[PDB]
Amino acid sequence: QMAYRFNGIGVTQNVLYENQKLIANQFNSAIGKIQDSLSSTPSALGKLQDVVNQNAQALNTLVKQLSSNFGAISSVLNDILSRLDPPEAEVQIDRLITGRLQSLQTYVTQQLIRAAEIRASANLAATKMSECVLGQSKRVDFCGKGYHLMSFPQSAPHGVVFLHVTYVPAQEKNFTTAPAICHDGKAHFPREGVFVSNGTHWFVTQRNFYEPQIITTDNTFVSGNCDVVIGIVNNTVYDPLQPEL
C-alpha cells in the first residue's frame, strides 16, 4: 500500500522496497515525536480551547448582564415590585425587559456568527477527512507540508486532529543537466526523469530521487533532429537489441 502511495508522488516502488526498514523506523519515530510534542507543548490545542473559552465567556457575560439597570431604578425585579404599584412597576419592568431582551438578542446574534465559523471549519474538516484520510491528495499543503502520503484521524474534544504523513526530500546534490541527448542525428528525451551528469558521465534518473541509470532506448524517446533543441548534449544512447545480435 505504501509502495502505491510512493508511486502516487512520483517515486518508483523499488525505492520503498529497498528501504522498507528505514521508512518504517522513520514513521515510528515521527509518531513518537508527535506524542512527545503534544504531551509537552501546552498551547498545541489552543484552537479547541478557544471555542470552549468563548462559549463559557458568552454564557457568563449573559449571566452578568442581569445586574444592569438599563435606565431603570434597579436591577432586581423583586425590589421594584415591593416598592411600587403596578403602574410604575410596569414602567421599570418594561425598561428591564427591553434591556434583557437586547442582551439575549446580542447573545443569539454572536452565537449565530460563531456557529457559521464553526460550520466552515467543520466543512473543511470533512473535506480533509474525505481527501487526506480516504485518499491520497495531489493538492499542495492541503494534507500537510511535503508530498502527501497518508493521513490518520484522531478524535479530540469538539474537534479532529489529523496526523499527516508526508514525504520530504533530503540531502540534495547538484548535477549538470541537459534538455536532450543527441546520439545519431536524432534528439532523445527522457520518458520519465531527467538527464544528469557528474561532469564526465551522463545518466537518466527519476526526478524526486537520485537513481542514475544508463541512457538506453527504453529510457528515452526520439523526436526530431539535433538542430532545434537549445542546449542539446552529445552522448551515446545504448541499444539493448545488439549485444545479443
Place this chain on the structure above:
Amino acid sequence: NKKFLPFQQFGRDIADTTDAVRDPQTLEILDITPCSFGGVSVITPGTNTSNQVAVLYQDVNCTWRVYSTGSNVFQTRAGCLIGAEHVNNSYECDIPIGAGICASYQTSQSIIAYTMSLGAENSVAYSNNSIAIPTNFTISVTTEILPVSMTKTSVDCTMYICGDSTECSNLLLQYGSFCTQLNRALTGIAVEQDKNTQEVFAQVKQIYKTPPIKDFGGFNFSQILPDPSKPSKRSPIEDLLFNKVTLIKQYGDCLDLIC
C-alpha cells in the same frame, strides 16, 4: 475663518454638534474642538512575569500628549512607544505592536522593541544547466487541529428575563414572537452541531476492525490504534488530547458558574 450670517449664533457639524460659536461681547467667530484625542495601548510581558509595562500612544509624533515621559522613547508608525528599548537586531514577533514593530522581554530584564524578521535569507544557486536532485528522504508526521462542533445551548426566556415573576411574564407577553425567534435560532445552531459532527466523523458506514496480529511490515500504529486495556477504548494520542482539553447537575447538588 467661518463667516456667520447676522441672524446666526451657533454652527453645527455633520453630527449636529456645536463646533462654531459667536462670542457675544466681541463679535468674532470661534471654533470649538474636543480635547480628548488619540488611542492608548499597553504592552506587558505578563503581570506574573514582571511589573514594568510599555505604553503605545497612537496618533502621537515624538520626532507632548503623553501621560509620563521616560528614559527611552521610540517613534514607530503606530505611534510613540515609551518604556521599551529600541534594538537594531531583528527577531521573530513575540508581542505585535504594529507597522513591522514587535516587542519582547529580554535580559536587568527589560522590554525591547525591534523590527520583525520575515525569515532567514536564502539564495538558490540557479544556473541554466544545473539541477539539484535529492539523494535521500524523511518521513514526516505533522498535526492539524480543526474545530468541528461547539456546545449546544438552550435559553428559557421567561426564566432569564422574568424569573419566577408572574407580573413580568404578563408584561413579556406584550412583545410577541421574539423569544420564539431566539429559541428557533438556538435550536438551529444545536441541530447544526450534531450535523457537523456526523458529517466529519460518520463518513464510512462499516465499522472496520484491525486484525489481532499487528504485523504490518515493521510499521507500528500502536500510538493511534485503540488501547483495549483502558475503560475508554481510545488511542494513547487520543487519551492525551482528551486530557489536554478542559471542558446531570441535579437541584439537590446545586441548592458554581454552571449552577
Place this chain on the structure above:
Amino acid sequence: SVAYSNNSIAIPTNFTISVTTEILPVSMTKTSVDCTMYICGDSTECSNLLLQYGSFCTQLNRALTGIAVEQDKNTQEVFAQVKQIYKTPPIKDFGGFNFSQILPDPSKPSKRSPIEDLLFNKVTLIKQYGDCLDLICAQKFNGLTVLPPLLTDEMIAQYTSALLAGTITSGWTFGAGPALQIPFPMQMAYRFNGIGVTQNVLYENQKLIANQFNSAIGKIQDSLSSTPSALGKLQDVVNQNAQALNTLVKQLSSNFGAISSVLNDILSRLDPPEAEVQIDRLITGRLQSLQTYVTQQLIRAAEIRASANLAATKMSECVLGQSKRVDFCGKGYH
C-alpha cells in the same frame, strides 16, 4: 453547434500561453471604538449614566479586537507561506522568459514590481492633534481609530518577491521541502508534462512560448493600466469600511426620541432628573448604533476571512504547485 460524429475527432495543432488576473481581498481595516467618547464624549454625567448598562462596551471592544487580530492572521496565512526569503540571481538568463514586470524594481524607493506599483497606484485608501485642531478627523474625535496592520506593504512585497524567486528558480520543490534548482525551460517542460503534453513540444517551440509569455505579461500590464474598474473588489472593501465609519459618525445627529441630539444642550437646559431621561434615550440610541456597526463588521469580517482562506488555498495550490483542478487557477490547462 459542435460537429459531433461517431468517428470524428478534433485535435489542436497549436497553442496559446494565456495570462489572466484574479483579484482576491485578504484583509480589511482594523478599527477600534472608544465607547465613552462616542456615546458620552467629554461628559461626566453621561459617563456615570452609561456605567449602569454593564459590559456591553467590553463586549463590543472584544468583538472589534477579535476582528483586528483576525485581519493580521489573514495576511499572515496568505503571504507568509515560506519562511526562507529567496532571492533571484543577478543574471536574468531564463531561456528567453522575461519576468521583469513581476520581479522587484531596485531603482524605486519601494522594492516593488511595475505591476505591483500600478496596482498600488490604482487603489486609493499619523494624524496628530496639532494638524487636526476631514472625515478621518471627525472619526477620530468620536472615539473611532484605525489601527495599522502588523505587516507593512514593504514586508508583503518582500514575501511576494521571495515566492516569485523560489518559483522561478526551483519550481514546485521549495513548497514541499528544500529548494532544488532547475533550469526554467526544464521546469516548464515538467509543467507541460503535468498537463499531458510531451516536453519536446516545449523544447521545439521554446522561443515561441517565451514570446507568447512575454507578450501576455505585457498585455496584462496594459489591461490593468487601462481598465479603471479592474480592482473593484479591494476598492469595494475600502469603500464599505469608510461608509460604515461615516454612517457611525453621522448617526450622532439623531435624537432617538429625545428632545435633542447634543449632550451639552440637554445638560444646559435641564436639571439632572429631567436631563437623565433624555441622556438615557441618547445612550440607548448610540448603543444601538454601535451594536449595529459591530454586527455588520463581524459579518463583513467573516466574508473577508472566507476570501482570505480562498486566497491562501490559491497561493498553496497555484503558486507553490501545479493544479489539476479545473478553473481553480485560471481558464485553460494550468
